[PDB]
Each structure stands twice: as structure tokens, then as C-alpha cells.
Write an enzyme that holds these catalytic residues in place. Structure first.
Site, PDB file in Angstrom:
ATOM      1  N   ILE A  65       0.820  -1.204   0.000  1.00 10.68           N
ATOM      2  CA  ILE A  65       0.000   0.000   0.000  1.00 10.68           C
ATOM      3  C   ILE A  65       0.854   1.253   0.000  1.00 10.68           C
ATOM      4  O   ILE A  65       0.527   2.227  -0.670  1.00 10.68           O
ATOM      5  CB  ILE A  65      -0.914   0.051   1.226  1.00 10.68           C
ATOM      6  CG1 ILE A  65      -2.011  -1.003   1.107  1.00 10.68           C
ATOM      7  CG2 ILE A  65      -1.509   1.437   1.361  1.00 10.68           C
ATOM      8  CD1 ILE A  65      -2.883  -1.116   2.342  1.00 10.68           C
TER       9      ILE A  65
ATOM     10  N   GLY B 134       4.028   4.486   5.565  1.00 11.62           N
ATOM     11  CA  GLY B 134       3.304   5.444   6.371  1.00 11.62           C
ATOM     12  C   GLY B 134       4.260   6.365   7.097  1.00 11.62           C
ATOM     13  O   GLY B 134       5.351   6.657   6.606  1.00 11.62           O
TER      14      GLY B 134
ATOM     15  N   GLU C 111      -8.309  -2.651   9.515  1.00 10.78           N
ATOM     16  CA  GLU C 111      -9.312  -3.051   8.545  1.00 10.78           C
ATOM     17  C   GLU C 111      -8.827  -2.401   7.253  1.00 10.78           C
ATOM     18  O   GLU C 111      -8.140  -1.380   7.286  1.00 10.78           O
ATOM     19  CB  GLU C 111     -10.681  -2.496   8.926  1.00 10.78           C
ATOM     20  CG  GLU C 111     -10.776  -0.989   8.821  1.00 10.78           C
ATOM     21  CD  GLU C 111     -12.203  -0.506   8.878  1.00 10.78           C
ATOM     22  OE1 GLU C 111     -13.046  -1.056   8.140  1.00 10.78           O
ATOM     23  OE2 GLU C 111     -12.482   0.419   9.659  1.00 10.78           O
ATOM     24  N   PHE C 112      -9.175  -2.986   6.118  1.00  9.67           N
ATOM     25  CA  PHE C 112      -8.733  -2.452   4.846  1.00  9.67           C
ATOM     26  C   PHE C 112      -9.785  -1.637   4.081  1.00  9.67           C
ATOM     27  O   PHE C 112     -10.849  -2.147   3.742  1.00  9.67           O
ATOM     28  CB  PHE C 112      -8.219  -3.607   3.992  1.00  9.67           C
ATOM     29  CG  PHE C 112      -7.927  -3.231   2.580  1.00  9.67           C
ATOM     30  CD1 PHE C 112      -8.939  -3.222   1.627  1.00  9.67           C
ATOM     31  CD2 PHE C 112      -6.637  -2.889   2.195  1.00  9.67           C
ATOM     32  CE1 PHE C 112      -8.664  -2.881   0.304  1.00  9.67           C
ATOM     33  CE2 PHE C 112      -6.345  -2.546   0.877  1.00  9.67           C
ATOM     34  CZ  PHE C 112      -7.360  -2.542  -0.074  1.00  9.67           C
TER      35      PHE C 112
ATOM     36  N   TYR D 148       4.798   5.831  10.613  1.00 12.26           N
ATOM     37  CA  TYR D 148       5.386   4.970  11.626  1.00 12.26           C
ATOM     38  C   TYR D 148       5.917   3.645  11.065  1.00 12.26           C
ATOM     39  O   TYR D 148       6.440   2.816  11.809  1.00 12.26           O
ATOM     40  CB  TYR D 148       4.343   4.699  12.713  1.00 12.26           C
ATOM     41  CG  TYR D 148       4.151   5.842  13.689  1.00 12.26           C
ATOM     42  CD1 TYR D 148       5.209   6.279  14.490  1.00 12.26           C
ATOM     43  CD2 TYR D 148       2.908   6.456  13.852  1.00 12.26           C
ATOM     44  CE1 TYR D 148       5.039   7.293  15.432  1.00 12.26           C
ATOM     45  CE2 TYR D 148       2.727   7.475  14.796  1.00 12.26           C
ATOM     46  CZ  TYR D 148       3.803   7.885  15.583  1.00 12.26           C
ATOM     47  OH  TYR D 148       3.652   8.879  16.526  1.00 12.26           O
TER      48      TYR D 148
ATOM     49  N   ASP E  32      -1.409  14.580  13.095  1.00 13.21           N
ATOM     50  CA  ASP E  32      -0.890  14.669  11.745  1.00 13.21           C
ATOM     51  C   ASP E  32      -1.955  14.338  10.725  1.00 13.21           C
ATOM     52  O   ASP E  32      -1.754  13.495   9.853  1.00 13.21           O
ATOM     53  CB  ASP E  32       0.316  13.738  11.590  1.00 13.21           C
ATOM     54  CG  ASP E  32       1.039  13.930  10.263  1.00 13.21           C
ATOM     55  OD1 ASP E  32       1.178  15.090   9.807  1.00 13.21           O
ATOM     56  OD2 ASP E  32       1.482  12.916   9.674  1.00 13.21           O
TER      57      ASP E  32
ATOM     58  N   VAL F 115       3.108   0.081   5.014  1.00  9.01           N
ATOM     59  CA  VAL F 115       1.766  -0.497   5.002  1.00  9.01           C
ATOM     60  C   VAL F 115       1.584  -1.375   3.760  1.00  9.01           C
ATOM     61  O   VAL F 115       1.738  -0.915   2.631  1.00  9.01           O
ATOM     62  CB  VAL F 115       0.674   0.617   5.000  1.00  9.01           C
ATOM     63  CG1 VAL F 115      -0.711  -0.004   5.098  1.00  9.01           C
ATOM     64  CG2 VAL F 115       0.907   1.583   6.149  1.00  9.01           C
TER      65      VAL F 115
HETATM   66  C1  D42 Z   1      -4.165   4.749  -2.284  1.00  2.92           C
HETATM   67  C2  D42 Z   1      -4.601   3.689  -1.281  1.00  2.92           C
HETATM   68  N1  D42 Z   1      -5.248   2.480  -1.646  1.00  2.92           N
HETATM   69  C3  D42 Z   1      -5.565   1.669  -0.527  1.00  2.92           C
HETATM   70  C4  D42 Z   1      -6.282   0.378  -0.789  1.00  2.92           C
HETATM   71  C5  D42 Z   1      -5.168   2.213   0.770  1.00  2.92           C
HETATM   72  C6  D42 Z   1      -5.395   1.664   2.100  1.00  2.92           C
HETATM   73  N2  D42 Z   1      -6.525   0.858   2.357  1.00  2.92           N
HETATM   74  N3  D42 Z   1      -6.742   0.549   3.826  1.00  2.92           N
HETATM   75  C7  D42 Z   1      -5.637   1.220   4.392  1.00  2.92           C
HETATM   76  C8  D42 Z   1      -4.809   1.888   3.411  1.00  2.92           C
HETATM   77  C9  D42 Z   1      -3.740   2.606   4.092  1.00  2.92           C
HETATM   78  O1  D42 Z   1      -2.877   3.359   3.639  1.00  2.92           O
HETATM   79  C10 D42 Z   1      -3.958   2.352   5.510  1.00  2.92           C
HETATM   80  C11 D42 Z   1      -3.244   2.872   6.690  1.00  2.92           C
HETATM   81  N4  D42 Z   1      -2.116   3.653   6.331  1.00  2.92           N
HETATM   82  C12 D42 Z   1      -1.212   4.184   7.156  1.00  2.92           C
HETATM   83  O2  D42 Z   1      -1.423   4.234   8.373  1.00  2.92           O
HETATM   84  N5  D42 Z   1      -0.068   4.653   6.646  1.00  2.92           N
HETATM   85  N6  D42 Z   1       0.030   5.797   5.664  1.00  2.92           N
HETATM   86  C13 D42 Z   1      -0.304   5.757   4.224  1.00  2.92           C
HETATM   87  C14 D42 Z   1       0.442   6.840   3.437  1.00  2.92           C
HETATM   88  N7  D42 Z   1       0.372   8.180   4.082  1.00  2.92           N
HETATM   89  C15 D42 Z   1       0.954   9.331   3.389  1.00  2.92           C
HETATM   90  C16 D42 Z   1       0.663   8.196   5.535  1.00  2.92           C
HETATM   91  C17 D42 Z   1      -0.148   7.138   6.266  1.00  2.92           C
HETATM   92  C18 D42 Z   1      -3.682   2.573   8.073  1.00  2.92           C
HETATM   93  C19 D42 Z   1      -4.875   1.723   8.246  1.00  2.92           C
HETATM   94  C20 D42 Z   1      -5.596   1.184   7.075  1.00  2.92           C
HETATM   95  C21 D42 Z   1      -5.132   1.499   5.720  1.00  2.92           C
HETATM   96  S1  D42 Z   1      -4.371   3.826   0.522  1.00  2.92           S
END
Ligand code: D42
EC number: 2.7.11.22
Length: 283
Positions: free
Chosen positions: A10, A13, A77-78, A15, A123, A18
């Protein structure tokens, strides 16, 4: 993990990275976040221990927490897409106001919930906001405290050295995201702390003891800061109606104490005609 398989990456992030994992036992798709390890503080694992109980419809649910081999994994969860992506995908026409109004309302509900539990996101940004086909938006990647993290949504009290900042910093961030959905351009696209701060000063005017009591005592406040005048909001966020503009200015107040609360914002006449539309998402 023995029960997980990185189906996709994905993205990295704040921290840790992902990936889109598939639970080998329950055959479900989840968002697996690999947290960054040289032992892993027991105080931190206890902080995250609380999070599993912080359940809200507008908060990406933390399914489990795996701390094996000193490595910390957070299974969420996604959801199918982030707001940043959705906006770029709507750049041609712009997200329809009823949708903008619905997402803002939902995020304010989520924030009101975290805040009532003494939890700050710290943030908030488009990329941390997840959406689904159902038309729901959720808060993700909370501040649980080598790219280039943006400061575009950073509150002024943070940029000026305030250590014990409040829940108001989230309202400021959401205020910047709100304006961005409406105008289809970042409100304050700073590329450095000082640049970020001055882009804010140039739009809302350089704060002083009049609009922000105690401002000149901030750690990073310099008497030598340029003195800019406040700009008209009608020029800043067109074509947002007065109600929208009224609410926005209250979320972008300099004085954290004067800044509107999440619960107060919910009662704002802007959401008098709020509805929950369904987005034209492309997965
Ligand atoms: C474009 C995208 N396509 C999908 C399917 C995405 C996605 N689906 N479910 C999740 C994501 C995540 O990023 C994500 C997530 N991401 C995360 O804490 N990290 N990061 C992602 C990138 N950004 C800039 C900072 C935060 C935490 C919990 C659930 C999910 S983003």
C-alpha cells in the site's frame, strides 16, 4: 507473520510501511502495518494497547496487534482508497459539495470522539483519511507518539515551538483539508517550517498579542517576523458559501483557545442541510 501474506505494498506510512495482507486463516484482506525495532518500549505497546478500545465508525478499526520477535505489527481493517487519491481523481470537476460536507461532518464526529478521550491525531492529512464505496471516511495513522513529510496541515502553535499543544491542532489540520477539497488546491503548501509559517502569515496575517494573546512568547516566535495583513476569505476559498467560510475561519483561528471545537463545529449551520452521498469511486 505466519497467518499473513503481503499481497501488495500500500505504501510507507509515518510509523512504518503499510502492505495489503491477506489473513491466511480467516481469508480476509487487511492493512498490515510493520512498525519500526531494538526491543520495543513497553510504555508504547501499552499506549497502543488502549487504541484497540477506541472504536468509532469514523476511525479505521485496529483489528489486532502482533508484537512477535521484538517486531510490532498493526493489522487494520482495509479500506479501498485515501482522500488524497480521491481528490486527484476529482481534480477535473471537484468533489461535489454535498460529499465535501458529508466527509467533514464525519471527520468532525470522529475527532469529537478522540478528543473526548484525550486522544489527538496530530498529523491529519488527505493521505491519512480513508474512504469506501459506502460513502464513509475514516481517520487513520494517528500520531502514536526518509521521505519528506509535509507541513501543509501543521497548526501554527506547533510551528512556533509549543510542546503541549491541544486538540485544536486537529481542527486546524481539518480546516486546511476542508479548504483544499473546496478549492482543489492546498491552502498552505509550505516546503519548510519557516516557509509553511510565512505562507500562513501571508493569508491570515501575522498574528500579534491582539488576535493571539501570548503569541510573542512562543519559543520560535521572532520579533523580526515580517508583518503581513489578513486577507479576505472570499478571495481565499471561493466558491465556498458564507456558512462554509464562517466555519472555516473558525477552524483556522490563530489562538488555539479561540479555535472552534469539533463538537461545536458539528452544530454549525453549515451542516444544517448535511446528507450522506455516495462517491463515484474507481478501484
Ligand atoms: C491509495 C490507497 N489504496 C488503498 C487500498 C489504501 C489503504 N486501504 N486501507 C488502508 C490503506 C492505508 O494506507 C492504511 C493505513 N495507512 C497508514 O497508516 N499509513 N500511511 C499511508 C500513506 N500516508 C501518506 C501516511 C499514512 C492505516 C490503516 C488502514 C489502511 S491507501
Amino acid at each position: 507473520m505466519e497467518n499473513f501474506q503481503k499481497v501488495e505494498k500500500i505504501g510507507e506510512g509515518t510509523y512504518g510501511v503499510v502492505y495489503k495482507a491477506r489473513n491466511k486463516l480467516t481469508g480476509e484482506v487487511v492493512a498490515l502495518k510493520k512498525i519500526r525495532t531494538e526491543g520495543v518500549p513497553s510504555t508504547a505497546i501499552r499506549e497502543i494497547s488502549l487504541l484497540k478500545e477506541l472504536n468509532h465508525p469514523n476511525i479505521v478499526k485496529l483489528l489486532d496487534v502482533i508484537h512477535t520477535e521484538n517486531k510490532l505489527y498493526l493489522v487494520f481493517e482495509f479500506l479501498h482508497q485515501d482522500l488524497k487519491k480521491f481528490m486527484d481523481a476529482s481534480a477535473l470537476t471537484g468533489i461535489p459539495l454535498p460529499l465535501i460536507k458529508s466527509y467533514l461532518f464525519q471527520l468532525l464526529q470522529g475527532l469529537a470522539f478522540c478528543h473526548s478521550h484525550r486522544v489527538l491525531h496530530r498529523d491529519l492529512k488527505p493521505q491519512n483519511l480513508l474512504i469506501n464505496t459506502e460513502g464513509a471516511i475514516k481517520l487513520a495513522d494517528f500520531g502514536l507518539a526518509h521521505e519528506v513529510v509535509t507541513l501543509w496541515y501543521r497548526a501554527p502553535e506547533i510551528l512556533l515551538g509549543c510542546k503541549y499543544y491541544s486538540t485544536a491542532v486537529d481542527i486546524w489540520s481539518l480546516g486546511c483539508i476542508f479548504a483544499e477539497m473546496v478549492t482543489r488546491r492546498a491552502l498552505f503548501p509550505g516546503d519548510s517550517e519557516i516557509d509553511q509559517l510565512f505562507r500562513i502569515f501571508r493569508t491570515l496575517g501575522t498574528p500579534d498579542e491582539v488576535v493571539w494573546p501570548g503569541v510573542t512568547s512562543m519559543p520560535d516566535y521572532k520579533p523580526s517576523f515580517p508583518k503581513w495583513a489578513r486577507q479576505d476569505f472570499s478571495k481565499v476559498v471561493p466558491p465556498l458559501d458564507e456558512d462554509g467560510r464562517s466555519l472555516l475561519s473558525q477552524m483556522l483561528h490563530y489562538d488555539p483557545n479561540k479555535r472552534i471545537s469539533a463538537k461545536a463545529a458539528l452544530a454549525h449551520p453549515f451542516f444544517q442541510d448535511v446528507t450522506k452521498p455516495v462517491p463515484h469511486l474507481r478501484l
